[PDB]
Structure formats: structure tokens, C-alpha cells
Design an enzyme around this catalytic site. Sequence first.
Site, PDB file in Angstrom:
ATOM      1  N   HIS A  91       0.285   4.348   0.722  1.00  0.00           N
ATOM      2  CA  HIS A  91      -0.133   5.436   1.596  1.00  0.00           C
ATOM      3  C   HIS A  91      -0.807   4.853   2.833  1.00  0.00           C
ATOM      4  O   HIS A  91      -0.710   3.652   3.090  1.00  0.00           O
ATOM      5  CB  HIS A  91      -1.104   6.374   0.870  1.00  0.00           C
ATOM      6  N   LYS A 118       0.854  -1.186   0.000  1.00  0.00           N
ATOM      7  CA  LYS A 118       0.000   0.000   0.000  1.00  0.00           C
ATOM      8  C   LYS A 118       0.898   1.246   0.000  1.00  0.00           C
ATOM      9  O   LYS A 118       1.754   1.403   0.871  1.00  0.00           O
ATOM     10  CB  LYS A 118      -0.906  -0.028   1.234  1.00  0.00           C
TER      11      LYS A 118
HETATM   12  O1  LIG Z   1     -13.272   7.976   0.665  1.00  0.00           O
HETATM   13  P1  LIG Z   1     -11.841   7.764   0.189  1.00  0.00           P
HETATM   14  O2  LIG Z   1     -11.138   9.098  -0.105  1.00  0.00           O
HETATM   15  O3  LIG Z   1     -11.714   6.795  -0.971  1.00  0.00           O
HETATM   16  O4  LIG Z   1     -10.985   7.204   1.453  1.00  0.00           O
HETATM   17  C1  LIG Z   1     -11.335   6.012   2.162  1.00  0.00           C
HETATM   18  C2  LIG Z   1     -10.870   4.786   1.489  1.00  0.00           C
HETATM   19  O5  LIG Z   1      -9.382   4.660   1.517  1.00  0.00           O
HETATM   20  C3  LIG Z   1      -9.001   3.444   2.088  1.00  0.00           C
HETATM   21  O6  LIG Z   1      -8.773   2.449   1.043  1.00  0.00           O
HETATM   22  P2  LIG Z   1      -7.307   2.155   0.477  1.00  0.00           P
HETATM   23  O7  LIG Z   1      -7.418   1.647  -0.909  1.00  0.00           O
HETATM   24  O8  LIG Z   1      -6.487   3.393   0.652  1.00  0.00           O
HETATM   25  O9  LIG Z   1      -6.838   1.002   1.485  1.00  0.00           O
HETATM   26  P3  LIG Z   1      -6.948  -0.646   1.389  1.00  0.00           P
HETATM   27  O10 LIG Z   1      -6.173  -1.106   0.175  1.00  0.00           O
HETATM   28  O11 LIG Z   1      -6.321  -1.089   2.708  1.00  0.00           O
HETATM   29  O12 LIG Z   1      -8.401  -0.970   1.315  1.00  0.00           O
HETATM   30  C4  LIG Z   1     -10.222   2.992   2.925  1.00  0.00           C
HETATM   31  O13 LIG Z   1     -10.201   1.560   3.078  1.00  0.00           O
HETATM   32  C5  LIG Z   1     -11.395   3.518   2.118  1.00  0.00           C
HETATM   33  O14 LIG Z   1     -11.729   2.527   1.119  1.00  0.00           O
HETATM   34  O1  LIG Z   2      -8.870   8.472   3.686  1.00  0.00           O
HETATM   35  C1  LIG Z   2      -8.159   7.443   3.885  1.00  0.00           C
HETATM   36  O2  LIG Z   2      -7.289   6.944   3.118  1.00  0.00           O
HETATM   37  C2  LIG Z   2      -8.387   6.735   5.220  1.00  0.00           C
HETATM   38  C3  LIG Z   2      -8.679   7.413   6.384  1.00  0.00           C
HETATM   39  C4  LIG Z   2      -8.877   6.650   7.613  1.00  0.00           C
HETATM   40  O3  LIG Z   2      -9.136   7.163   8.681  1.00  0.00           O
HETATM   41  N1  LIG Z   2      -8.745   5.251   7.494  1.00  0.00           N
HETATM   42  C5  LIG Z   2      -8.451   4.528   6.337  1.00  0.00           C
HETATM   43  O4  LIG Z   2      -8.355   3.297   6.323  1.00  0.00           O
HETATM   44  N2  LIG Z   2      -8.272   5.324   5.194  1.00  0.00           N
END
Ligand SMILES: O=P(O)(O)OC[C@H]1O[C@H](OP(=O)(O)OP(=O)(O)O)[C@H](O)[C@@H]1O
Ligand SMILES: O=C(O)c1cc(=O)[nH]c(=O)[nH]1
Lengths: 206, 213
Positions: B105, B103
Site C-alpha cells: 500500500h 509494500k
Molecule cells: O498511524 P498509522 O495508521 O499506522 O499510519 C502511519 C504509519 O503507516 C506507515 O507505515 P507503513 O508500514 O505503511 O510503511 P513503511 O513500511 O514504509 O514504514 C507510516 O510509516 C506510519 O508508520
Molecule cells: O497512513 C499512512 O499509511 C500514511 C500516510 C502518509 O501521509 N504517509 C505515510 O508514509 N503513511
Amino acid sequence: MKPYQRQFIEFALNKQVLKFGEFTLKSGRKSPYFFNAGLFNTGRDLALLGRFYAEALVDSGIEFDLLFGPAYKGIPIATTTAVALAEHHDKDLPYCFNRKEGSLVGSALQGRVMLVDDVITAGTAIRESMEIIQAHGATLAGVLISLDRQERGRGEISAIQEVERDYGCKVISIITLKDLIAYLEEKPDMAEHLAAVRAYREEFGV
Amino acid sequence: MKPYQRQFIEFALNKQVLKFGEFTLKSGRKSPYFFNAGLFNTGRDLALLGRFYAEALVDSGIEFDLLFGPAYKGIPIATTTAVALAEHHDKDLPYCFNRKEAKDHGEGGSLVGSALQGRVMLVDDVITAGTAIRESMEIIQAHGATLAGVLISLDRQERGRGEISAIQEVERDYGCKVISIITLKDLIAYLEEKPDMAEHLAAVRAYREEFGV
Ligand SMILES: O=P(O)(O)OC[C@H]1O[C@H](OP(=O)(O)OP(=O)(O)O)[C@H](O)[C@@H]1O
Ligand SMILES: O=C(O)c1cc(=O)[nH]c(=O)[nH]1
Ligand SMILES: O=C(O)c1cc(=O)[nH]c(=O)[nH]1
Ligand SMILES: [Mg+2]
């Protein structure tokens, strides 16, 4: 804040789900806090988490024909939510999830989809999931997350209002940042963290 | 067989996960029956499946400290299995699953859930080639943990590319124990009790004779 929300907060905190530090969100925003649902790391945590989601789903009254969980956080979340619905609400729902690589696992992606995820910040994930959902000819009936961070989306309006406006769906959450903050106002050695959160909200909050 | 094994067979039969006919396996063989665990795809299927996996794990008595579900098919199985253990057996176990890629970020990393440590119980549906395990083993080793066992739904009990079975290859190449809810023999024993399944039972017997053990 209702009693169940206080319970959810305490559950999340007992699991160190709420983290403080220098985070860069999916949306690129530099956040002082992060809610990591991946930390509900044991079977007991997963079981209870699903119970919270199923309760919210049944209470909402939103009609849906399938539960979709975006990879990766949405995968265990949709699985336990689906299990809770069957075990405790006598509701047998087809479920489905994608590969982050689209390629799907589970039931056929059709009908009025209820997407379950951990949090909503800018609405990026929901938008990405919709590409897949619309690609399978399905529609979006609703979105349910653990925490509504109550931030703006791609514009000035809240991420939730934007999603509801763009897909004609209803977004619900177990708790909101406001609830989390109200709770933390009661706890010691939180002042600095709360101040940091406020500073952040002044910029992306709505 | 134990009642849960009999119950699992009926369950698989009910949802069409277990079916009889002519299916060309990965090896190229013509099998008179097929097991498609991917057909367990609703909340109730998931709930029951986890209960059966939990029953199988508790029955074996094998000790473990972590339930690992490899991406992607193993994630829901490990999740529902972890839930069943906590809800129906009062056994609260840490779970974990991997990301296909790191990941960039948020929390970062390539693992979700618990730290990969201790005696790991790998959770899966079936083992064909007996090599998909090597990939997960690699991750388990990269984290210093040990592979205590592999939990699967059905053991087809048929030799791989040479003499021994895919499951036996796994156990010898990784020194772990493969736990299965049911086996080809359990299927035969089941069809034995159902008089109508007579013609299928004969075909499955023939196949086991030629490819079994
Ligand atoms: O409303 P948003 O701006 O999209 O932010 C929230 C999203 O970001 C993260 O996913 P991410 O893909 O970053 O993490 P993951 O691969 O662990 O699911 C989280 O699980 C949400 O799905
Ligand atoms: O916006 C995101 O990437 C984010 C915020 C948060 O509090 N938790 C998460 O899993 N994603
Ligand atoms: O060996 C195979 O190809 C195979 C057999 C079976 O029963 N199920 C499956 O998914 N693969
Ligand atoms: Mg996500």
C-alpha cells in the site's frame, strides 16, 4: 504556525515529500495525499531531519530512556534523531529498531520508550510497535512524528487521543495537517488538491 | 596509520566492540579477538561511527553516486554515514536501502530513499563468508546500477575457505574496491604501541601467521 514549522514545510516540499494522488493508507483509507518521509533521500536531508526531531524531543520535556523506530521509515528516522541528540544536544541515548518480518537491532529494548516515526494516521503502527515494546517489558513514554494527519483512530476520537489514552503517553508532532494546509493556502494551483484534502477530512478528520 | 584509524581503534575498544580472548568464528576457527559492530548502539556511538566511515571514504578518494545500506544492519550505517559526509565534509550524497518485501500500500515498491542508479557504495560492518554481498549485488543489478565499492569497518584479512580472503573474493567476483576503516594489521600496529597489550599482541600475531593474508 511558528517559523520552524514553516521551515520544515518548505523543506518537505522542496523534496517532493508531499504527494497527491489515489493512495491507500496503511489503515486502508483512500487518501488524496501522502507524506513520504522516504524522500528525504540525501545525507543533507537526513541530517536536517534529525535536527528537527531532536529539537522537538528536547523542547517537549518528555522523559525517555530509549529511542525506538518502527521499520521501515522509523529506522533512518531514529538513527538520525539519535545522532542529532548526541551531536547537538549532548544527549547520548540508546536506540533500537525492529525488523518488519521480534528481532531487534541496537540497544536492549527497556525503559521508557520514545517512539519516533514519520506520521500518525489511525495509530496502527504505534499499536504494532507496542506489541513488541510490551513483549520486552518496556513502556511507552511518548511518540514523535513529522506529521500529525489529525484523523480518527479505530473509533471516533483522534488517533492521538486514543494512543495517549491506551498507553498513557504523550504524542507530539513537528507539524499537523492544519499547518500544512495553512501553508498551501498561500500557494497557487493548490485549490483542487486542497479541496480534495477537505473532502477526505470530512470523513476521517477530527 | 592515519589518526582517524588510531582513533577508531580506541573508540571500538572503548565501547567493547573490539575485544580479546577466545571466540569461535563462523568458519569454526578460534580467534584471540572479536569485533562486534552491533555494540555501537547509542546516538553518540552512531554519530562517531558515521564520522569514522566518512573519514575512511574521503581518505580512499573512491568516487560514487549513491550510498546503499542493505536491510537491516546496513540501514543505520548508511544513514549515519550519509549524515557525516554532509555535516563534516560538505558532501551531500543520495542514500537508499531495500525492504525485505514489497509494500502492499502507500507508495509501494521495495526501495526506500533514492533510486538505485550509478556507482553504488555498499555500506556494511564486516564481511565473513563473503556471500551476503551477492544478495545486495542482485538488487543493484536488478536496477541496472554498478557496484563501485563496499565500505566496511574492519578487514580481518584472513583467508576464506581457500587461499584468498573473503574481501579479496568480493573484489574479484564483483570488480569493486573494498574500503575498510582499519585492518588486522592496524590492530597489530596499535597493540604494538600499548605495552600492556603485550600478551594479546602475541596471540593476534600467531593467528595472523596461520590464517592471515
Ligand atoms: O498511524 P498509522 O495508521 O499506522 O499510519 C502511519 C504509519 O503507516 C506507515 O507505515 P507503513 O508500514 O505503511 O510503511 P513503511 O513500511 O514504509 O514504514 C507510516 O510509516 C506510519 O508508520
Ligand atoms: O497512513 C499512512 O499509511 C500514511 C500516510 C502518509 O501521509 N504517509 C505515510 O508514509 N503513511
Ligand atoms: O568471521 C567471523 O565469524 C566474525 C569475526 C569478527 O571479528 N566479527 C564478526 O561479526 N564475525
Ligand atoms: Mg512505518
